[PDB]
């Protein structure tokens, strides 16, 4: 009675980068109040702030290359997703990245998730 | 005040993990329970026993790490999610990425089990 975590992750990642490229300003409508967002720079928290952060980064004509994506079940019908790839902006240099997300039942509508955590880091910023 | 700091449960976990990796890796199965999935280099083997078996497969001998940064944040049900970025020699350091999810044990707080452990060298992706 249970979607495939693995599948559920690729679907999410697909939705994520389409939307990050199409309209990155309802992007915050993926997260609830108690979410976490990053992209050394501290994470920011909840909708209004995650939304505000997304704006601050002028995401424009945003291209991706998802080179890898694991996902598993985690505590309480959650789903965690590792994702490694290349991301561009203002059609500039593609930079490697390493990403972790937690998806967790939204709970009102069944089999609908929300992003409790979205940790993203460029290898060139850390390595 | 009611729950441990996440980052602190995060940065101390990594400490215990990769240390216990250079030290006896025939102990890591301690860290896990019977809902726990382990995924190194790739479908997850569950439980202390298979994960142990999987650990041992890897002949972790004089494992050398080098953490470059760590994110640990709070997730549902007082869980701590943890993305690690570093280099792992086990021999040339190999850029890597390890995601964890730490879940409250239940009986007592400040006490957690590793529900999840997903590893990928980068030079295998890309
Ligand atoms: C209905 O609630 C008004 C608010 C509304 N926000 C949300 O629901 C947020 C908080 N949630 C989402 O957008 C998530 N969408 C869903 O959960 C969707 N469900 C489904 O397709 C599933 F049944 C089928 C699977 C894809 C799991 C195989 C859907 C259509 C919205 O129910 C994303 C982040 C996601 C989650 C998992 C996998 C891919 C994408 C919203 O404003 N928009 C959707 C815009
Ligand atoms: C019969 O044996 C009996 C089972 C037994 N297993 C466990 O408790 C498992 C199920 N769990 C662990 O080991 C976890 N350990 C802890 O939660 C410990 N807490 C702490 O030191 C810190 F959280 C303290 C604070 C950071 C909150 C200020 C503690 C004291 C044991 O509660 C690890 C996975 C973890 C997870 C997140 C952050 C750090 C460490 C166990 O064997 N040990 C505790 C010993 C051991 C040795 C070596 C490796 C693992 C376990």
Residue numbers in the entry:
A (entry chain C): 4 to 42, 51 to 138
B (entry chain A): 3 to 43, 52 to 100, 103 to 138
Quote from the publication.
The most central node within this network is the RNA-binding protein G3BP1 and its paralog G3BP2. G3BP1 and G3BP2 each exists as a dimer, with each monomer comprising a folded dimerization domain (NTF2L), a folded RNA recognition motif (RRM), and three intrinsically disordered regions (IDRs). Dimerization via the NTF2L domain is necessary for stress granule assembly, and experimental disruption of G3BP1 dimerization results in rapid disassembly of fully formed stress granules. The NTF2L domain also harbors the binding site for other stress granule proteins, including the RNA-binding proteins caprin 1 and USP10, which respectively promote or limit stress granule assembly.
For example, Chikungunya viruses inhibit stress granule formation through the interaction of the viral nsP3 peptide with a specific binding pocket within the NTF2L domain of G3BP1/2. Here, we designed stable molecules to mimic the interaction of the FGDF motif of nsP3 with G3BP1/2. Two such compounds, referred to herein as G3BP inhibitor a and b (G3Ia and G3Ib), bound to G3BP1 with respective Kd values of 0.54 and 0.15 μM binding as assayed by SPR. To better understand the nature of the tight binding between G3Ia and the NTF2L domain, we obtained an x-ray crystal structure that revealed a number of important hydrogen bonds between the compound and N122, K123, and F124 of the protein. In addition, a key phenyl ring in G3Ia extended the pi-stacking network formed by F15 and F33 of the NTF2L domain. While NTF2L is also the dimerization domain of G3BP1/2 proteins, G3Ia and G3Ib bind to an interaction surface that is on the opposite face of the dimerization surface, thereby leaving dimerization intact. Thus, G3Ia and G3Ib target only the protein–protein interaction domain of G3BP1/2 and specifically block G3BP1/2 condensate formation while leaving the dimerization and RNA-binding capabilities of G3BP1/2 unaltered. The presumed mechanism of action of these compounds is through antagonism of binding between G3BP1/2 and their binding partners within the NTF2L domain, such as caprin 1 and USP10. The loss of these protein interactions within the NTF2L domain is predicted to limit oligomerization of G3BP1/2 proteins, thus inhibiting the valency necessary for the formation of the large multimeric protein–RNA complexes that comprise stress granules. Using the nsP3 peptide as a lead compound, we designed two novel small molecules, G3Ia and G3Ib, that inhibit co-condensation of G3BP1, caprin 1, and RNA in vitro and inhibit the formation of stress granules in cells when added prior to either arsenite or heat stress.
